[PDB]
């Protein structure tokens, strides 16, 4: 009886909130973002009997990453030379070589342009792929750049070769990060192996669709995550563990040519072509792909107990979703993937190698916006890149009769990063509390 208030200081307890986060840079980074801030030595401490909940669909920093990536791109591109004077009437028929149909923008086109002195005009020419050209009304020999009817076009600075450098985040003073480590977690619900860290591990700002690549891999068996408010989900994420390797190549040898716009800025394009002409392609080990699809199918049925399962290729929309889109080196790609999803199922390593044929177009739009078409400078010579994949993005039609179906999508750039930050939830510590005791001043 007769207990009295004791006021402890700095007791461990937290509540949810949202706050800005520091972004760390690698110790040997590119060289505001190039070489700072510093790189720490991370550590992870495991705990006992810690009770906590997570929600991968609500957590904060997913939104923040969207701002950071766009801010970085804006900083990188802002000072580079605009291409506005280049946008003028093109005159082309372009059948000067035995290979004209596949590209149709050939050397020997012509468009009046300003020379290095401001009151004289000159005639030039260069290559273009028809996927970046459109035809004006009437005379079928006149052409215009696709995005110039609506926006200005900016050119990547030739000395800039930005690539996916990993980034990891550190909470500011007063906040703490919780991680969870149970290997069967669905992405929403309680955890029983809570943990705390100095900072998150590496994350790469990779841009792709129909599947995410160069990313990390799972720790256990394949997992499937989704929202659970209603079956009519937007995007279902499937996370792989077994890495299926992939290769892609571009055999032709591109020749770099240039023009100068005054006062002091140069413009690049594609000129002569060397070697025999072929379409770009990729390869896959059908063994591994079919085995992975088998496992996915036999895991996917858990939410759909008894219906048949069948895949079909994507449908409609701009090329950013009809195909697989990814970039290697300094140029982009688009790859039709009908063959890799025409399968089916029902209830109850180089053999058979598959190939797929792709295309490359220069002019690009940041997947979301209008008004900011990026222009890529062509890369001379041949290009090839090994790569591997770790997950797929699936959306579903209207389930009918005794069958259910999935198809590949994922055009919203948000989801990609949603697939690599399901772990962390950021909270704030409340270092003050109260309790009763019996101690006496004894003054």
């Amino acid at each position: 009886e007769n207990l009295w208030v004791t006021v402890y200081y700095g007791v461990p307890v937290w509540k949810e909130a949202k706050t800005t986060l520091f972004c760390a840079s690698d110790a040997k980074a590119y060289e505001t973002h190039a070489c700072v801030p510093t790189d720490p030595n991370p550590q992870e401490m495991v705990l006992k009997n810690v009770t906590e909940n997570f929600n991968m669909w609500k957590n904060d920093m997913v939104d923040q990453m969207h701002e950071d990536v766009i801010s970085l791109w804006d900083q990188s591109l802002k000072p580079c030379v605009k291409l506005t004077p280049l946008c003028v009437t093109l005159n082309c028929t372009n059948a000067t070589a035995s290979n004209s149909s596949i590209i149709e923008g050939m050397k020997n086109c012509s468009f009046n342009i300003t020379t290095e002195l401001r009151d004289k005009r000159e005639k030039k020419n260069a290559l273009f792929y028809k996927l970046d050209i459109v035809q004006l009304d009437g005379n079928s020999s006149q052409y215009r750049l696709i995005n110039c009817n609506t926006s200005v076009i900016t050119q990547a600075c030739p000395k800039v070769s930005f690539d996916p450098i990993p980034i990891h985040y550190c909470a500011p003073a007063g906040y703490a990060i919780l991680k969870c480590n149970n290997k069967t977690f669905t992405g929403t619900g309680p955890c029983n192996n809570v943990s705390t860290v100095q900072c998150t591990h590496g994350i790469k700002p990779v841009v792709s669709t129909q599947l995410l690549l160069n990313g990390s891999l799972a720790e256990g068996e394949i997992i499937i995550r989704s929202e659970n408010i209603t079956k009519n989900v937007k995007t279902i994420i499937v996370h792989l563990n077994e890495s299926v390797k992939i290769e892609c190549t571009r055999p032709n040898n591109k020749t770099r040519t240039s023009i100068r716009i005054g006062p002091g800025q140069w413009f690049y394009a594609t000129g002569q072509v060397i070697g025999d002409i072929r379409e770009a392609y990729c390869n896959i080990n059908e063994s591994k792909w079919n085995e992975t699809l088998q496992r996915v199918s036999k895991k996917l049925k858990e939410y759909f107990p008894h219906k048949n399962i069948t895949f079909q290729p994507s449908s409609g929309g701009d090329l950013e979703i009809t195909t697989h889109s990814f970039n290697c080196g300094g140029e982009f790609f688009y790859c039709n993937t009908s063959s890799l999803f025409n399968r089916t199922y029902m209830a109850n390593n180089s053999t058979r190698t598959i190939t797929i044929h792709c295309r490359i177009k220069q002019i690009i739009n940041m997947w979301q916006e209008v008004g900011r078409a990026m222009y890529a400078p062509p890369i001379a010579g041949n290009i090839t890149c090994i790569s591997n994949i770790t997950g797929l993005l699936l959306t579903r039609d209207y389930g009918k009769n005794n069958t259910e179906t999935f198809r590949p999508g994922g055009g919203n750039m948000k989801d990609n990063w949603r697939s690599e930050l399901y772990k962390y939830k950021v909270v704030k510590i409340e270092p003050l509390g109260v309790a009763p005791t019996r101690c006496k001043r004894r003054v």
Partner: antibody, heavy 122, light 107 residues
Framework: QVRLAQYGGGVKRLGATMTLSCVAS????????IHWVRQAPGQGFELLGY????????DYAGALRERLSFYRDKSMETLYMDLRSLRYDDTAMYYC???????????????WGSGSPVIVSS | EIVLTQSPATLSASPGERVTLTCRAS??????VAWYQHKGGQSPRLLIY???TRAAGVPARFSGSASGTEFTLAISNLESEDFTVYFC????????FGQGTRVDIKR
């Protein structure tokens, strides 16, 4: 404050292709879906399919995947619907509707539009 | 798949009365339901979504609740301009609609 207005429609001849259209207003064009719903006279509604403006994905109803068509342009905030081989039984009203949505689920319809009829006769 | 059975096809009332609508479902759809307003040659509008929460600009006399496999809508104090057709809607599996019930003059 936000509106969805329609143009086109009117009478059409049997067995002919037909068009409709909806024009967005300044709320935001990239942050919401769009649906097309119709109503035969003296009948319960039904749904056709939903088109996202962001990338252009369609997803048709199960009963009409051979005959419908969607596409959009973000530049002028416009959406076009193509319907082919009008049967006699398609005579009805058509609406556009916005559709609130979170990052991972779809909920309901909250702002219907102008309403446009179509009549088929030889 | 999902079907909503709307009954009765008509309700009779007079101004100042309290009228209750009802909507039945083929199978459970959680709390995912909403009620809509529709008038002669006009643009329908939102009344209630999530079966409990009212939206902005709505009159304060609307109310309703869920019943597991049934849904209830009620007008606390009927006004003259409230005489119209209403229909229930669900959004759990794939979109569908009811047939529509009309308010009627009591006699």
């Amino acid at each position: 404050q936000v509106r969805l207005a329609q143009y086109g429609g009117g009478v059409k001849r049997l067995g002919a292709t037909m068009t409709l259209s909806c024009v967005a207003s300044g709320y935001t064009f990239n942050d919401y879906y769009i649906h097309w719903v119709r109503q035969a006279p003296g009948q319960g509604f039904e749904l056709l399919g939903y088109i996202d403006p962001a990338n252009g994905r369609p997803d048709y109803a199960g009963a009409l995947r051979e005959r419908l068509s969607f596409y959009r342009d973000k530049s002028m905030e416009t959406l076009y619907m193509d319907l082919r081989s009008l049967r006699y039984d398609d005579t009805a009203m058509y609406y556009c509707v916005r559709n609130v949505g979170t990052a991972g689920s779809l909920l309901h319809y909250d702002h219907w539009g102008s309403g446009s009829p179509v009549i088929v006769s030889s | 798949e999902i079907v909503l059975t709307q009954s009765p096809a008509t309700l009779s009332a007079s101004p100042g009365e309290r009228v209750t609508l009802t909507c039945r479902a083929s199978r459970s759809v959680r709390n995912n339901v909403a009620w809509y307003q529709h008038k002669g040659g006009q643009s329908p509008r939102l009344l209630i979504y999530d079966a409990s929460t009212r939206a902005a600009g709505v009159p304060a006399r609307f109310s309703g609740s869920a019943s597991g496999t049934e849904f209830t809508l009620a007008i606390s104090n009927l006004e003259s301009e409230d005489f119209t057709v209403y229909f229930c809607l669900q959004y759990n599996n794939w979109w569908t609609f009811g047939q529509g019930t009309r308010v009627d003059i009591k006699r």
